[PDB]
Ligand binder design. Structure first.
Ligand SMILES: CN1CCC[C@@H](Nc2cnn(C)c(=O)c2Cl)C1
Length: 108
């Protein structure tokens, strides 16, 4: 557990401090995206992920990876490809992928 928790903490740290992480630091507000919570069925953001991680809710890598991936896929499904949010999501998603591959967390 201690090795996994250490790895996941470092990953989320690097992701949340990335220059393209800013759109994902807090949950999407209804007022800023009317209808978001109708069309995006499972919202996720990095504050929520930090709360879940700190609460020791991620006893497997799989939940953590799925939640973090969904931050980016939600963004890239909702927003226009030419939007800054979409572009940030694409960049940060690639960073995320590099971090999980670096840690040996991809399925063998
Ligand atoms: C709370 N708010 C702070 C600024 C950035 C924003 N991020 C959004 C907003 N709307 N939508 C639709 C998004 O996809 C994102 Cl990432 C979230």
């Amino acid at each position: 557990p201690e090795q996994l928790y250490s790895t996941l903490k470092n990953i989320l740290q690097q992701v949340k401090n990335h220059p393209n992480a800013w759109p994902f630091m807090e949950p999407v507000k209804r007022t800023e995206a009317p209808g978001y919570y109708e069309v995006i069925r499972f919202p996720m953001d990095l504050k929520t992920m930090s709360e879940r991680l700190r609460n020791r809710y991620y006893v497997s890598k799989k939940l953590f990876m799925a939640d973090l991936q969904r931050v980016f896929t939600n963004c890239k499904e909702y927003n226009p490809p030419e939007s800054e949010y979409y572009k940030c999501a694409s960049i940060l998603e690639k960073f995320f992928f590099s971090k999980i591959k670096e840690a040996g967390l991809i399925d063998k």
